[PDB]
Design a protein around this nucleic acid. Structure first.
Lengths: 150, 47, 142, 37, 103, 110, 56, 117
RNA sequence: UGUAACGGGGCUAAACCAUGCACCGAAGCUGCGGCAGCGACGCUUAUGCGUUGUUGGGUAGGGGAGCGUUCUGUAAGCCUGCGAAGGUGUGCUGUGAGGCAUGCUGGAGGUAUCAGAAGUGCGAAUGCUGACAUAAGUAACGAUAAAGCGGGUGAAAAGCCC
RNA sequence: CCCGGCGAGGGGAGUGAAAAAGAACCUGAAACCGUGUACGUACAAGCAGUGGGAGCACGCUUAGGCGUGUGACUGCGUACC
């Protein structure tokens, strides 16, 4: 705190309480007692606990019928209108499309749709499998997922 | 279902917060008794 | 339900005349204190004056035992400093005997506003007659 | 007025005078201490 | 005509058609109870108990309302020793109504 | 009909004004003016100007007939203090509270 | 020389029970001018007991 | 995450000051004095939920003692009599009969003197 | 300092001694109602009860279980100008921290549930800052060189101008 | 427009959805200070409450004898850290 280390009054004889710095944490304008620093909040997750967790959530997406397996899922042109109509035809609004080969046109078609997210089979995370209502995996993505999760 | 996940039973223990009130159990002296070198900030003898 | 409380608007209270000739001072005094509290009535209530009006007469003829006629000393202090003023029992009977019965009863009655109101009901006379023939006091033989 | 009041509360904060209580207040504390000895 | 009867823990002096607040009985709300342990019946001739409870007397009372009484705060402060403890309490009651008193 | 006049921020503390206000409270208005004319206070000048303003607001902004009016409410609130400094001895200062007030006269015929 | 417990507002008003101002109590009416004035004083127009005085 | 503490502190203080309405002076205005007043009222209220049982009992005993001496027997002898007569009327009710029903109380005194002789 | 060595009145028994029977007397024991802990025990099995025994004063201190606050996810959801937060009352409710509903003010935001992180709860520190009391309409109004009157100006003159 | 000292401040009028949104301006708490109403209080001693509790005033209420405010009198009671 931007101040001076001058003691504000004499130690004894004023009837004031004794004080030593104008930057004390009890004083207004004074400096937080246990002031924070920038910190790292990362936790270690063991690799077998990460993979175990993905196996549990995939097993529950299968068990709760939130996992849809299509053979192919690609859009004609990079238009959000086409993907909106395609997801409308399949009775899906909130959806995580996951494809073993990341199509460019699908990626550009889902970039404006709020509820819809397109991933590659490599970059799936627990919070999106749990977050989205339905997960639509390409069959190739299913094979790559089994190769990842052994 | 991210608002239905829940930890195990017994895994997250609370954490002692000292200095808050009479009911909490650890207020005024925080569990460190009356005066002495050990009830002092920084206080304690070496190993 | 709740325990009955006497209501001071609706307390009926009687008038009694007691002849204090040859009675012992403390024993008469204790009976009067009991009757002025209202302890003899089933509607007794500790914050209500339920007692009776007693007319003590012949107060100069009250008796004490032993040498208390001359050795019992009534001290009081006047507020000025060396103001300790004593008076024996026979000096009090000569000067004002009403003060003898009234000091006794007053010390037997609860101190406080209520017991002052209880003492206002005691009427003591040094003689044999009283002005209170209008209230028709019946003769309390005690 | 507020500035003059903060500075004129800040007048006897760094004092030295020992016969005067708090730098300014007159007393008899020299004789009180001296007689206590 | 009143009657004194023993009830939950304690005793009650009750006429007919009078609502009494007893302790919590284990009875349904509209159900009728009987107190077979009456200690006094007075009409203009007293009837009471040489050996206790009167031989021929009973009180029929209809339960009116189970309930839970006024909250009271219980405060336990030990001055100067760093101890205070507050607590609360609402007592269960049972309002019955005296249907009849049989001498 | 109640008719209000106020002097907000009147340089006189509310205690000193409340003496005068306590004089004229409840009176008929001509009697209240005769009391404030012959009260030797500074507050009686202030209270008289508020009362005269309330009679005028009554007779102009509302129904007339001064002679029926009565001082129903009068009260003196406290206003903001002006915080000044008195230089005392040995180098010490004091705050002087130069106190204001808020005079309210509610006059009415009913 | 200084108080030892802060006095209440009760005791404060009790002390001020006597600080009340007395009213005028009735002011008298001139004989000639018919106007009002303090008794034994001259009027605002400068009369007293029905005769003209000062006249400024 | 800085937490300002104005709104909840206001609620606690206000809770305590509502529990102190009717107290004289600062005891009903200032928090720091109304807290002590409210606690000391709590301790007294506890203590007096016990004393009201003691005080009511001594009131009842004084009324039965008065009415029973009106019927020519003391309280001590009357309670002994009724216990020997095997009467189990508690003394709330004996005080209440002794006020409201003089004839029933007279009859209770007759049971007490009957068994006591 | 004032009786002033029975708490007091007062007592010749209302004192002492001996015997006896009563009664008063506590948060003790019992009765009735309720809650909680630790055992045991037949099921219920992931625990509750017909039970059942017993325990529940507490400082330093140890153990257990919770409430609230702000922030993140759930939440582009759900409340909200038919009126949010906040403020101020009332009513109901829980063993408690507390919760819920609603009148008036307010005028635009709030957030379930289940998780997560804490600048997470103040009456004290001759605590820090602001506000406001208290003494109190009290002391004082700063050289004991000294003022008085007439007139003017003015809304008003002991103090200004002549 | 009116009071007012060609003031200060205010009362109307008008704008405004709202001027107790008026520039001393969103919300507007508490301490502190008032005005009005109900009750108590001028023979009564003390941590100012608490247990009991009459009376009075307002609301009820098919008088059901309740609720709120006050609180004479009375037992007990020497703040917090």
């Amino acid at each position: 705190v931007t101040g001076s280390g001058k003691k504000p009054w004499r130690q004894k004889g004023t009837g004031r309480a004794r004080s030593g710095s104008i930057k004390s944490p009890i004083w207004r304008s004074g400096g937080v007692t246990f002031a924070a620093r920038p910190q790292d909040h990362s936790q270690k997750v063991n690799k077998k606990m990460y993979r175990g967790a993905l196996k549990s959530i995939l097993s529950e997406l299968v068990r709760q019928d939130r996992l849809i397996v299509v053979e192919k899922f690609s859009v004609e042109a990079p238009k959000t209108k086409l993907l909106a109509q395609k997801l409308k035809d399949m009775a899906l609004e909130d959806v995580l499309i996951i494809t073993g080969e990341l199509d460019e046109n699908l990626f550009l078609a889902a970039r404006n749709l709020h509820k819809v997210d397109v991933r590659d089979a490599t970059g799936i995370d627990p919070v999106s499998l749990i977050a989205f209502d339905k997960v639509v995996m390409t069959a190739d993505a299913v094979k790559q997922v089994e190769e990842m999760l052994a | 279902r991210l608002n239905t996940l829940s930890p195990a039973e017994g895994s997250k223990k609370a954490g002692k917060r000292l200095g808050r009130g009479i009911g909490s159990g650890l207020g005024k002296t925080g569990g460190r008794g009356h005066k002495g070198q050990k009830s002092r900030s920084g206080g304690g003898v070496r190993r | 339900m709740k325990t009955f409380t006497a209501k001071p608007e609706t307390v009926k209270r009687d008038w009694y005349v007691v002849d204090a000739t040859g009675k012992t001072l403390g024993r008469l005094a204790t009976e009067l204190a009991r009757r002025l509290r209202g302890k003899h009535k089933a509607e007794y209530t500790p914050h209500v004056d339920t007692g009776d009006y007693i007319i003590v007469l012949n107060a100069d003829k009250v008796a004490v035992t032993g040498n208390k006629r001359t050795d019992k000393v009534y001290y009081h202090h006047t507020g000025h400093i060396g103001g300790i003023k004593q008076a024996t029992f026979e000096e009090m009977i000569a000067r004002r005997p009403e003060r003898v019965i009234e000091i006794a009863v007053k010390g037997m009655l609860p101190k406080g506003p209520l017991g002052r109101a209880m003492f206002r009901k005691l009427k003591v006379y040094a003689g044999n007659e009283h002005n209170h023939a209008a209230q028709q006091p019946q003769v309390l033989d005690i | 007025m507020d500035i003059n009041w903060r500075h004129n509360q800040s007048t006897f904060y760094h004092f030295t005078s020992d016969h005067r209580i708090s730098g300014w207040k007159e007393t008899n504390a020299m004789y009180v201490a001296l007689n206590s000895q | 005509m009143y009657a004194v009867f023993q009830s939950g823990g304690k005793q009650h002096r009750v006429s007919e058609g009078q609502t009494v607040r007893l302790e919590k009985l284990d009875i349904a709300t509209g159900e009728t109870v009987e107190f077979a342990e009456v200690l006094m019946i007075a009409n203009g001739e007293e009837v009471k108990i040489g050996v206790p409870f009167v031989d021929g007397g009973v009180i029929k009372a209809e339960v009116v309302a189970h309930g839970r009484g006024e909250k009271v705060k219980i405060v336990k402060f030990r001055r100067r020793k760093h101890y205070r403890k507050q607590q609360g309490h609402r007592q269960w009651f049972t309002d019955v109504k005296i249907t009849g008193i049989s001498a | 009909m109640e008719t209000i006049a106020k002097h907000r921020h009147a340089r006189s503390s509310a205690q000193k004004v409340r003496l005068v206000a306590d004089l004229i409270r409840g009176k008929k208005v001509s009697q209240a003016l005769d009391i404030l004319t012959y009260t030797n206070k500074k507050a009686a000048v202030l209270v008289k100007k508020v009362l005269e303003s309330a009679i005028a607001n009554a007779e102009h902004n509302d129904g007339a007939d001064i002679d029926d009016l009565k001082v129903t409410k009068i009260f003196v609130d406290e206003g903001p203090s002006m915080k000044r400094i008195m230089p005392r001895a040995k180098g010490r200062a004091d705050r002087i509270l130069k106190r204001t007030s808020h005079i309210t006269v509610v006059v009415s015929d009913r | 020389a200084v108080q030892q417990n802060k006095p209440t507002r009760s005791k404060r008003g009790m002390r001020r029970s006597h600080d009340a101002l007395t009213a005028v109590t009735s002011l008298s009416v001139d004989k000639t001018s018919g106007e009002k004035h303090l008794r034994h004083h001259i009027t605002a127009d400068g009369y007293y007991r029905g005769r003209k005085v000062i006249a400024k | 995450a800085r937490v300002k503490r104005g709104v909840i502190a206001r609620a606690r203080h206000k809770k305590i000051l509502k529990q102190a309405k009717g107290y004289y002076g600062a005891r009903s205005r200032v928090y720091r004095v109304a807290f002590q007043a409210v606690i000391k009222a709590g301790q007294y209220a506890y203590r007096d939920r016990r004393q009201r049982k003691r005080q009511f009992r001594q009131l009842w005993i004084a009324r039965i003692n008065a009415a029973a001496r009106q019927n020519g027997i003391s309280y001590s002898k009357f309670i002994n009599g009724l216990k020997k007569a095997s009467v189990e009327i508690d003394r709330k009710i004996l005080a209440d009969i002794a006020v409201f029903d003089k004839v029933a109380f007279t009859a209770l005194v007759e049971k007490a003197k009957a068994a006591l002789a």
